[PDB]
Amino acid sequence: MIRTGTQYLESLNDGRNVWVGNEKIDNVATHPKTRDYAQRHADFYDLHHRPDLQDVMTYIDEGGQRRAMQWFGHRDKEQLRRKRKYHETVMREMAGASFPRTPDVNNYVLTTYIDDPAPWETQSIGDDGHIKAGKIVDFIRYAREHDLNCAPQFVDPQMDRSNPDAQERSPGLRVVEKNEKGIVVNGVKAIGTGVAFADWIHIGVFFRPGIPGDQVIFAATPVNTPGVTIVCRESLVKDDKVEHPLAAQGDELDGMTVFENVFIPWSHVFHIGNPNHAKLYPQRVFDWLHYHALIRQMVRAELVAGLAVLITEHIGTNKIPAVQTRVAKLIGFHQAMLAHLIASEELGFHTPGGHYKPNILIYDFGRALYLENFSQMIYELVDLSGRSALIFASEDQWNDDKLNGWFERMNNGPVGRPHDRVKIGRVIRDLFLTDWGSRLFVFENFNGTPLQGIRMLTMQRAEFSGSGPYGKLARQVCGID
Amino acid sequence: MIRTGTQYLESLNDGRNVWVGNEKIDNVATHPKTRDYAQRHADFYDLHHRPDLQDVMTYIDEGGQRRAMQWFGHRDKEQLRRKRKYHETVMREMAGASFPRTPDVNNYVLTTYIDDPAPWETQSIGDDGHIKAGKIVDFIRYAREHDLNCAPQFVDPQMDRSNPDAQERSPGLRVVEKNEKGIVVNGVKAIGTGVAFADWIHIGVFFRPGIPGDQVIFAATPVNTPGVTIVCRESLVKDDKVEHPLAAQGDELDGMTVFENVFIPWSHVFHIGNPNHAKLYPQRVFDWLHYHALIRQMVRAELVAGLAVLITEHIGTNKIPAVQTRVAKLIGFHQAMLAHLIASEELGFHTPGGHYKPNILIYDFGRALYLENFSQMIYELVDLSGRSALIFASEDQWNDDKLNGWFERMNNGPVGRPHDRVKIGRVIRDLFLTDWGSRLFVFENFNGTPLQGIRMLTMQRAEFSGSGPYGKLARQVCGID
Amino acid sequence: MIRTGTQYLESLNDGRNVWVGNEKIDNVATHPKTRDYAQRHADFYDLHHRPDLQDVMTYIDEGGQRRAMQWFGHRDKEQLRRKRKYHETVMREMAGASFPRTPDVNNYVLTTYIDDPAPWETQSIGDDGHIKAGKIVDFIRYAREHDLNCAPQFVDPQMDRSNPDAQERSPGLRVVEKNEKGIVVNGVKAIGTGVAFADWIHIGVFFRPGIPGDQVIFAATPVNTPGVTIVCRESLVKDDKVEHPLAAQGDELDGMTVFENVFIPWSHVFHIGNPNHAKLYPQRVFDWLHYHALIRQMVRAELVAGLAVLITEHIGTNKIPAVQTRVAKLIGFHQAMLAHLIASEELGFHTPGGHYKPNILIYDFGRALYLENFSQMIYELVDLSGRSALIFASEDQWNDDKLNGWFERMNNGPVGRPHDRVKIGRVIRDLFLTDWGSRLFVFENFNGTPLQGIRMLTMQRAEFSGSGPYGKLARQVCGI
Amino acid sequence: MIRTGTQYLESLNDGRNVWVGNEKIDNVATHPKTRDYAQRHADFYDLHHRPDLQDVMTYIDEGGQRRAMQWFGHRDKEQLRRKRKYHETVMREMAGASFPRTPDVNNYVLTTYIDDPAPWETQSIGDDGHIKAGKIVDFIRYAREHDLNCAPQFVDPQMDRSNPDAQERSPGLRVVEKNEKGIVVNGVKAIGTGVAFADWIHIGVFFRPGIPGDQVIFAATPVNTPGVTIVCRESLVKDDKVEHPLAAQGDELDGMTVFENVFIPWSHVFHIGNPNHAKLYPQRVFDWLHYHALIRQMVRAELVAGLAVLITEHIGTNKIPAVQTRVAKLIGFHQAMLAHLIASEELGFHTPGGHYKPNILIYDFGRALYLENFSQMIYELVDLSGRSALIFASEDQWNDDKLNGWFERMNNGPVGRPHDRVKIGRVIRDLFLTDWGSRLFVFENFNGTPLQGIRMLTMQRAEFSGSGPYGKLARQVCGIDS
Ligand SMILES: Cc1cc2c(cc1C)N(C[C@H](O)[C@H](O)[C@H](O)COP(=O)(O)OP(=O)(O)OC[C@H]1O[C@@H](n3cnc4c(N)ncnc43)[C@H](O)[C@@H]1O)c1[nH]c(=O)[nH]c(=O)c1N2
Ligand SMILES: Cc1cc2c(cc1C)N(C[C@H](O)[C@H](O)[C@H](O)COP(=O)(O)OP(=O)(O)OC[C@H]1O[C@@H](n3cnc4c(N)ncnc43)[C@H](O)[C@@H]1O)c1[nH]c(=O)[nH]c(=O)c1N2
Ligand SMILES: O=[N+]([O-])c1ccc(O)cc1
């Protein structure tokens, strides 16, 4: 059947070597600093067993077996919308897209290998013909069958951006041995989200100038592999769910993976050795994460606009003309992200393997627009709230004999329900005035590369030209051709 | 048959009373200050007779008569996209959207009356039953049959914004008599575009607090109607078509219409007397204009991004990383305008008479997003050009035996064709650095109300509430009942 | 003699009734939620006894008494710069302007009273001649003498912004009884910073339409007055100073003060009963908090520009031309705050009592320019750091026998010193990505009214006219 | 005496070879396309003869000669503020800062040479001891004695930015001969303002990477030098001064200068040969024009904010709270430009020659701040006007028997004076909605390099390191060593 939450939490007790800040984690599923976000993954798995959600969360495969939608391939626009409906439902069900790396997101990128596996094999260098397209498809089919969480770690160490000669010194993961059975790898995958909570690490790399072949590695290994150490930032999870209804639900840890002479059988190596292959194929893997981030950006905008409507209605600024036009900014932002999501689905194309991909240019520029504006939109939500965004009663101040009477009168705006301003306050404060929400803004700003990086890669990949179909209108107006 | 350019130029010599700055106009079709823009309408009609454009420019109605697509009703998504393609082709064929009130735009707004003529009659006050749904339909059918340009004049005078007392001292058009033949109107329709080049004036009004019943008028009268005087700003048309390839094509005049005891028969009056009717119904008339705005916004953004690509290629800054990401901004802006347009088409609804209308929130917030960003985008196009946007050879300077070799070397960038930099500069200069191009920015900024107006009206119209479907997600996250 | 830190910590244990979140505080000086910030006030008082800082931190008065510069009155430009240099050195000494309401700032507004004390009396209504302009000056000179911290609480409750009538039902502090000994006040001062840490509450009011006379209260009372309750948000202080070098130094708490039938003698009442007097004179009180806010804006801008320089150097991006222009924005922002501070001092004027005041237009518009750009400037600093703002070693990770070699190598940029990037990361994280740093952003944004508030109040007070010497040039160019 | 306006008009008819668009110019003083801007320079010269302005416009030198304040050297802050009050007065009397390259601006850069001439000589390469510091000083004394306008042409051809190696094929002015009498130069000074209206061309370069040594020429030659052609864009002057009260006052033409084997004597050669000299010293030359640009930015911000007050008052939006905070934006900008100007004066330093210079970081970052915000400030003024910015009566429409009554009622806002709204519109239209207005914006945006250039150059020249003053506080807070 489809994996359950209990099966997930049980499988975390597997020997994995995990730091979270200054601490060592006995069992990710039960430790104070990690159990809350482990239960969030459990909840994710449990949503696929909820009968009111079976139509949206699951599908019948051609074999007759019911599967999680996170394994659903899409070959047309209607199939894309069904996938987007699944991703959207998962992030709405889970604290308003507050947990952006649920397994559905992690595993989405695997579909690029399924679509066209051969080039990974044929462009390899130094595998002595042991890498097999069939084994790539086999690993992914294995992930599907067991509902395994493959956490992607691709990005380089942030060592020294001064040098193009930097990558000779790199502590980045390299191949130190190749034999009949597989490769041995040594060094760091410098950054990943949620790896302490995953089953398998999806290893990969982006091209950088001068990248040696022994650091071009796409492969998979279990989180509990001997030689693997997960090294995570301190947990930001909060002990009081009444004061912090979002931040008490757990912290989606980020951190690095140390590999000490780790063995990886050829059956789980997708490609090694070719810098050129690392140019466009890695971008094709992360495309699916870029499209997904549009779904998130839309739910996030919708939340921020919503919270603006609620708080201005409750303090009674909502009918002040100058505030109406500020709330219109946050609402316009949401409609903009909605427009880009729907436009990307309309203007899509079929890949080599005949999968339907949404419009690259629309979702990538949609992400750039989100990152350009997001912090201004949070400034606006906080600014519209005035003091109610931070200076509200603790629940015990509120319910105290002496203080209750004063609290209730100070929060007596036009839509009654005085305690409700404390509820809106709590969510605004968790989402954007705590360590826990600040991490989410950093994740959002960096996970798919930041604003200048999005723009640079999109232009390098598009190869826009004066003589290209881009310029036809300009050329005609100037009388060139 | 479909009206020809020749027929239209003939029809302009009808004794209409026109000021264009300090001059009176004997014949708008031949006067130096108007003939170039009169020929631009002539070109508009003539497009409908190009054999290679007949599928795009025309359709076959239920009688078997061929008609210009400006009279085409859209009853579903596919018919809308077919209407948008027509509009897109019209503005691409006419100086890349430099003439935004061609007759297709002007007459689009009449489809609201056709869709649901009855409320215009039934809600009329003081007409003594004289106004009939049938005659509203009969006028619009008469406009169709003769391909008439009905220029909309709705907006008030801009006299005193400080108080609502403003509508009693207003020279705004008022009914001074009602008899059994029709109405006599006296006063001003303060602002119109292209009236001097129209066949009929489409009179309307928007609600404002305390608007008297006698100023609520929706009617139609010929431009040459006795007592109608058309008073236009000075003409910005340029004399040298080589130096000003766009500004020499003609100036789409704006200005005001004086009515002195003008008689309109009941046959040509659509509604009078009801301020409440003027709240929602006029907005419904201009929805079609706001949608069309989105189409122009896309084509304008595509021309701006194309000029950025062209000029940065020509001066050889296109591969400079820091410039590449500035050009990403302008391309990003175009993709945002493409997303809103397609998304509005995708997320539309059926009106009372079963016409398909695009999503009001998406097209209205698309216009907001364009007005908020437009000046920044012009500034980046001009800033990326350097001196080449303004300081370039006149054609006699370029071709002088002595100066030619110096200009050739000065404009010999990485893609050669040195004179092509003058071709691009001329277009940038005309669009963004002449009185002629400034007028178009000002039109674009005000015609559909400015940014703070779009935001206000859109919010007032949408009755957004925290209880409504909008605040659903935020309420769930906040734990509000 | 100038008060010591020890003396100040001792005096906090005076029975003051304080909530911090869900907890009651028996002693503000020693409770884990409050002791660190309390010690920051104790540090403040001790900076005045340092013989190496004496020439900046203290002055000799007419009597020959060494007094703290927080009590120094400036009558010319030179003297205003000496006061400012004091405020600057205080904010550099205390974790880069991270504690914006040290006593020097709190007590600065009292100089408006010292300058023109009469009106406060002469415009009072229903006091029966009990309020003396003599007794306001006596209080402030008593505070001076005993280096007393007087915390300003003027702002209204945020109840209902739809209704203008909603100043009658409001729990705003009102005068319920006026007798011969003094007044009795009941209700709420809805918002204050650091009141739990202060000696006295400075009770004021700003004017809103239809403010009733019984709600127009300018007064002072001790923080431990019977019937006073201090109610503060939960404390955001961090446990581990290694991981959180700024957030572990303590949380400058914000809260409300509840007054339950609180008696205030006439000697400690400044003004009552006149909505008219509450238009101009309360703004003139907070003008000094406003000027000071520009000194902080400059130092905060300087701090942010210096972290941008430190972090872009350490990761090796500082020479990438496109990063260079982004660091340029943060450096220019600093220079913009510097320019406004120095311009405001140059174009100052004398008040009625002969005090030198910096230009109101410049320091107030300087504040608007800060609020407008600040969140975009934080965005640039964080964006410029990349992962290094947040994803970095904990200290036990750094030091581990297995991880040290990896961390040393991953952090080895052009200016070597690999652990230095963790130090920069810890400060960017604390300043801008914690509970603690966010409150400083919220405080900056609201304490002096938000941007749309600064703009409208500045316009309404300036009363800018087409016919006044603003559009002088515009009239001339127009032929009007 | 100080040179008069009329004397200036006579000096223009000196055989200079001048294109303005497709037309050759016989006399810049009198030609329809140039005569108005020629009269604005004549007005400049006549301001120094107005007895009501004698104190502001002129000084007495060490020999008792009364001289135009454009030649006044400032050795402290009081002197700098006297020079700034002079520049401010000139731009206020001349169409509210609408003519940014009056002779006072052009001639201001020459003070860098006067301050410290030796390095122009000592750093010269391949001159064989012919370039003399005393002669740079003698040229500037001669300029001062004849009140001559030296127009500065420094910037390169905008040919190909793709590779520095492309400067191989660049038609930028090069030395094509050095002999005992002087040099011969051939090619283009690609860009300059008001050269058609100047007496002498001030020639220079800025370092770009790969600039060829043979293009490193700092010199001066007359505008009518044989082998010089001035080639200007088309004139944007307007016919009807009632309808265009600013753009009818004339067009400060921009363009390029062609040198065909032009002879410059060693006496008028300041420096040749050394790209390394061209890194710092040319920026010191243009510093004075970056300071001046801040004075213009304050007067221009003052004008915009004023126009915003005047128009919102007239249509009656000025008490609408939402409009009130938008006008605060325009006023805050003016305040910001003021703040930068006054801070830069307060925080100035003495140069090697003893001249007082205002603070470089503050005037240049104030310039950056203006280029970043200017486009948005003009949008705000135009957006605040509504239609009053463009759609208003022409004067004959206003005065018509039939339309007057409608126009008077349509313009009858809370401050009466109906025709004043047309007057405000005319100014708003001319500044921001004509070709003449667009050229000023384009001038302000590029003349002192654009935003990304200002920022890039200020960072390269100040070299702000983590171990310098700018990292002192952050190091302390982070506990990093110094
Ligand atoms: C919270 C979180 C979570 C994750 C990740 C990051 C973070 C912060 N990442 C890695 C993420 O993609 C990465 O941080 C970004 O790509 C940015 O890279 P750097 O941190 O190295 O900044 P980097 O040093 O590249 O950037 C520094 C700053 O300088 C600018 N800059 C740098 N080089 C420039 C240039 N040449 N021109 C112009 N500007 C330049 C950048 O734009 C940026 O503003 C990741 N990765 C992964 O594979 N799987 C994962 O799950 C995650 N998860
Ligand atoms: C951290 C902290 C610390 C302090 C304080 C606040 C905070 C948050 N304050 C109080 C502070 O001055 C107050 O929060 C601000 O004046 C903003 O007021 P409100 O919070 O009531 O917002 P309010 O409800 O007034 O405003 C909320 C939002 O709506 C907008 N808005 C409201 N009315 C509007 C209108 N009519 N037109 C247009 N826009 C409008 C505002 O611009 C803002 O964006 C304070 N006070 C004090 O006296 N001493 C102190 O020490 C402190 N300390
Ligand atoms: O480093 N990179 O090139 C990246 C990293 C992440 C991403 O989503 C795209 C590209």
Author numbering:
A (entry chain A), B (entry chain C): 1 to 481
C (entry chain B): 1 to 480
D (entry chain D): 1 to 482
Quote the study that presented this structure, word for word.
HadA is a flavin-dependent monooxygenase catalyzing hydroxylation plus dehalogenation/denitration, which is useful for biodetoxification and biodetection. HadA belongs to the class D two-component flavin-dependent monooxygenases, which use reduced FAD (FADH–) as a substrate. Each protomer is composed of three domains: the N-terminal domain (residues 1–146), the β-sheet domain (residues 147–275), and the C-terminal domain (residues 276–517).
The co-complex with FADH– and 4NP allowed identification of four binding sites for ligands in which strong electron densities could be observed for all four FADH– molecules, whereas only one 4NP molecule could be clearly seen in the expected pocket of subunit A (Inset). In the active site of HadA, the 4NP molecule binds in a hydrophobic pocket (consisting of Val155, Phe206, Phe286, Thr449, and Leu457) located between the β-sheet and C-terminal domains of each subunit. The aromatic ring of 4NP forms contacts with Phe206 face-to-face with π-π stacking and sits in van der Waals contact of Phe286, which forms π-edge interactions with Phe206. The unusual face-to-face quadruple π-stacking interactions of four aromatic moieties is the site of “dead-end” complex stabilization, which prevents the formation of C4a-hydroperoxy-FAD, causing inactivation of HadAWT.
